[PDB]
Design a protein around this ligand. Structure first.
Ligand code: HEM
Ligand code: HEM
Lengths: 554, 554
């Protein structure tokens, strides 16, 4: 009973439940027609039938680097880059649609921005299985799936050669828009602003942003330890910070994102970006002696946002895609498109970025391995080695494979367990529903999913139906592409959430991406040539190896 | 000293002050080039030179109704309507640009949404005149300009034949997005949501919205006086309401916008829309017996927003434009355009909608005139005459001319005085700067402005330079078009602020304007055929004369 439990409306048509026993699919401009939105318009049809396999497109982006050096040297770089942007971005709705409270559009869902859109509604709470129709009557014990399948047995490094500089960049970056409320529950972001507002550096709330500001030359407060510039102490900026009970204000560093006390990893980066902010303030001060503090501050936040979003497209995403296409951040590729410039980070996007397999077994800085119980919460390590050293270290140690399964180190394995349970509170739909939704074809067996027989078989025994595989488990347990860090679904589902958040940033709008926004060519060129090496090395007394890539191929 | 005081950058290029003594104009994609953004690209040029006079275009929209009956019967209705939408909407920046605190783009200006964008920055606080360069060293005494020029001498009715149903619709409507904070100051809207969020019916803050809700069938609370449905008392919904000290809870009606106790006018309408909400709830309940309260509520807010925004385009704006073009609200005209769906109501747009000249000398309901001291705060009048009667009355009494000057009745003349003083705190730029900005040509004399010699001459004596006429005074004192309620500037500056707020509503987005949003065809057709007569008459026991127009031409 309840027709919408059968997920009847295909090609993202919407199932509105009508009088009691019946329902209706709204196929408004889905490209399909008829009662379950399934008969293709001739165009719709032709497009889909000619669309090449995802797994195949991947290989073309990792086919002969010669041809791609040539394509990268022509304007086709720009064409394909525009096209990646448009095509991938169209899959994410704008304005936002639903949230935990509403599986319909409402104005509230549209304005209460403490919320996280979901792109697919809840499994209706009146369905037979907790997953709709198919599946076991009661889901697998989370604790169990994680120990049995997610847990690191033997460390598998990522084949693409990702290092911890990347692992930690990703952590830092992600934690400016993923900040689940806790005190309100799942759904609910405390990181309102919903994207690359650099609130991990400056604060999710103004009051804290003023607490971290110097209010001189547009600068941010800091402290000076040994030779260098390190974040101020909670002594000099009250701000808050989560630190294990019994750690003292003085020894705590005040940062922006309250969690970053947790590891050096997080702290390292927040130091680089504070140093970078100061630097930019001074160039801007030099340029405009009139400016005054507030304008220097705000213009600096804009440059650094421009920097962050360039480094992410041209270096971070270029590292984990592994495409030979040279990606580029040129906002102007979208000025001819019908693109909306706004973003709402989705709860599903939060599940998908739960990629803790990157974290290794121990942390080798210098020639000494550190345990997690030495690394996590170590307050001195940063100050002791200094930004230069740690960058080099993290740049050399490899990060783990994400996809494939059996790779979450036990110290953090509990997190993946909480993720699966949140999928459950969240009532996230099946995996495959999301597969369909992101333009992919559903798995017919776990054997197709995994790509082996042993796990697949037990997984089958547990879930009961491939059509009942939970979203996060399936994401992590799917077969990796060739010799890649994850497989098909991570890229096809993750990529649109990521490119809309990046290019849907107001800065990229024709209205804002003008040189004056940044304070004239000076500022504007700083965002236009930002580079990870430049970020680290211009703020360090000596340049280490800095890369998202593990060296030389060693 | 301070180059930007001379307003150097033409065609809305932006004057960034550089090292001390010098500055630079950023002409990024203005269509013009060179140091003050003045040399036209050949396209830019050709367009502008071929653009017909505004005053002329107006006459074409009030040229032979025969030709316009034919154009209205073809698809050209839709073409011109699309074109009005695109063309007018392009003049308003999206995302928002500045605010009182920032005359540069900043992320804060972009996210602290208690703010009101201004489309042109402040007169820099270091300029010689308070208006930049030109003008008297100290501005005209507000008190004086208003008594001398704004004040109603003899009532001039509006020639277009606008009535008080319109006067009060406009008041009600406007007060859902103009809610200056007071406790924070000028700048600062308490009506966050910035547009047609129907927060005048439902509340600017959720907590109050829950206080006004019944939480049964999606309905809103109410009370039953004599035969009809009237808003609940502050007794039954705490909510707040501004009522003159000493009025008791029971006699106060609880509404949504706290000010609406002030007049029957405001209350009358809030009664119609509460009755309309309930009605819609029931149709929706009838359609979907499954639905439950929250979804009925939210789907009703969406229908009523759709209604409000139709009635405004096809009836309200059609009444005060007086064009023979039949305007239409069809969101689909913009699905091919590059339109951004977001709005931020501007402080200037608040000044311009300060059009208090509509209010008459006394209020004749029935055959008895009421004084302002009988009308304002009269708690019984609504209940005493009932919605039916008052609609008829207000539908017959004519509203005053807006433009032209000398028409603000003394009882409310003080308001216009506060407006001019807020223009001053706000440091709003000259009038003409805004003229240029909205694609018009500046006045060379007050004589050109006004269109007579006596006021113009004294005005000149007071302001010192035509290029120093304050924005609101100039708006109200400019010569009315032919036999129209206001003149050129009110339409050319007001119209874009208005059409972006209307069509930049999320509901109009391709993502939302689907039948399901509204709950299937039923709901969707209610927004698609909404009419003022339907609004009033389907919620009243007997249909009066209902119009924005004064009858028959009498
Ligand atoms: C490889 C880098 C990492 C990435 C990309 C990553 C990503 C994430 C993300 C996206 C969240 C969700 C945040 C929210 O919405 O509130 C999260 C939560 C969490 N992560 Fe990580 N993380 C990483 C490394 C770590 C490490 C090293 C630890 C170990 C200290 C860790 C422990 C946790 C915990 C405890 C939570 C919050 C509690 C919970 O979800 O139940 N993460 N992580
Ligand atoms: C013809 C209909 C009217 C329109 C279109 C109109 C419009 C406005 C607007 C746009 C505001 C600004 C609201 C804000 O930002 O806070 C306002 C303020 C005000 N109006 Fe009206 N109004 C109308 C009739 C009236 C009447 C009849 C009165 C007399 C009781 C009145 C008295 C005021 C007062 C006292 C203020 C607030 C104080 C101030 O601005 O100093 N208005 N009006």
């Amino acid at each position: 009973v309840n027709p919408c439990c059968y997920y009847p409306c295909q090609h993202q048509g919407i199932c509105v439940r009508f009088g009691l026993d019946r329902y209706q699919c709204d196929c408004t401009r889905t490209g399909y027609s008829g009662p379950n939105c399934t008969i293709p318009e001739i165009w719709t049809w032709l497009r889909t039938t000619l669309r090449p396999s995802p797994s195949f497109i991947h290989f073309l982006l990792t086919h002969g680097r010669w041809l791609w050096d040539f394509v990268n040297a022509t304007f086709i770089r720009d064409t394909l880059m525009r096209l990646v942007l448009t095509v991938r971005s169209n899959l994410i709705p704008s304005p936002p649609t639903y949230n935990i409270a509403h599986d319909y559009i409402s104005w509230e869902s549209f304005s209460n921005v403490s919320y996280y859109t979901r792109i697919l509604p809840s499994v209706p709470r009146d369905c037979p299985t907790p997953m709709g129709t198919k599946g076991k009557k009661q889901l697998p014990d989370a604790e169990f799936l994680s120990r049995r399948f997610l847990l690191r047995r033997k460390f598998i490094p990522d084949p693409q050669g990702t290092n911890l500089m990347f692992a930690f960049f990703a952590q830092h970056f992600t934690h400016q828009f993923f900040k689940t409320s806790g005190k309100m529950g799942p759904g609910f972001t405390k990181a309102l602003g919903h994207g690359v507002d650099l609130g991990h550096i400056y604060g999710d709330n103004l009051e804290r942003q003023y607490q971290l500001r110097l209010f001189k030359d547009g600068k941010l407060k800091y402290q000076m330890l040994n030779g260098e510039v390190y974040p101020p102490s909670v002594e000099e900026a009250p701000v808050l910070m989560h630190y294990p009970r019994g750690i003292p204000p003085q020894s705590q560093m005040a940062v922006g994102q309250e969690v970053f006390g947790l590891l050096p990893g997080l702290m390292l980066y927040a130091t680089i970006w504070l140093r970078e902010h100061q630097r930019v303030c001074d160039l801007l001060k030099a340029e405009h002696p009139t400016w005054g503090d507030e304008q220097l501050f705000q213009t600096a936040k804009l440059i650094l946002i421009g920097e962050t979003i360039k480094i992410v497209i041209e270096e971070y995403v270029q590292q984990l895609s592994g495409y030979f296409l040279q990606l580029k951040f040129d906002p102007e590729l979208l000025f001819g498109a019908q693109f909306q410039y706004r973003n709402r980070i989705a709860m599903e996007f939060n599940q998908l970025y739960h990629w803790h397999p990157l974290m290794p077994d121990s942390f080798r800085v210098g020639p000494q391995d550190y345990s997690y119980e030495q690394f996590l919460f170590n307050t001195s390590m940063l100050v002791d080695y200094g930004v230069e050293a740690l960058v080099d270290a993290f740049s050399r140690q490899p990060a783990g494979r994400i996809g494939g399964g059996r790779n979450i180190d036990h110290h953090i394995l509990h997190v993946a367990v909480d993720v699966i349970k949140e999928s459950r509170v969240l009532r996230l739909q099946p995996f495959n529903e999301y597969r369909k939704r992101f333009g992919m074809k559903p798995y017919t067996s776990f054997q197709e999913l995994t790509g082996e027989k042993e796990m697949a078989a037990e997984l089958e025994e547990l879930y009961g139906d491939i059509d009942a595989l939970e979203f996060y488990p399936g994401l992590l347990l799917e077969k990796c592409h060739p010799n890649s860090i994850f497989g098909e679904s991570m890229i096809e589902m993750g990529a649109p959430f990521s490119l809309k958040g990046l290019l849907g940033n107001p800065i990229c709008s024709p209205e804002y991406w003008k040189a004056s926004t940044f304070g004239g060519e000076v500022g504007f060129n700083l965002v236009k040539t930002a580079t990870l090496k430049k970020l680290v090395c211009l703020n360090t007394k000596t340049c280490p190896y800095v890369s998202f890539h593990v060296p030389d191929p060693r």
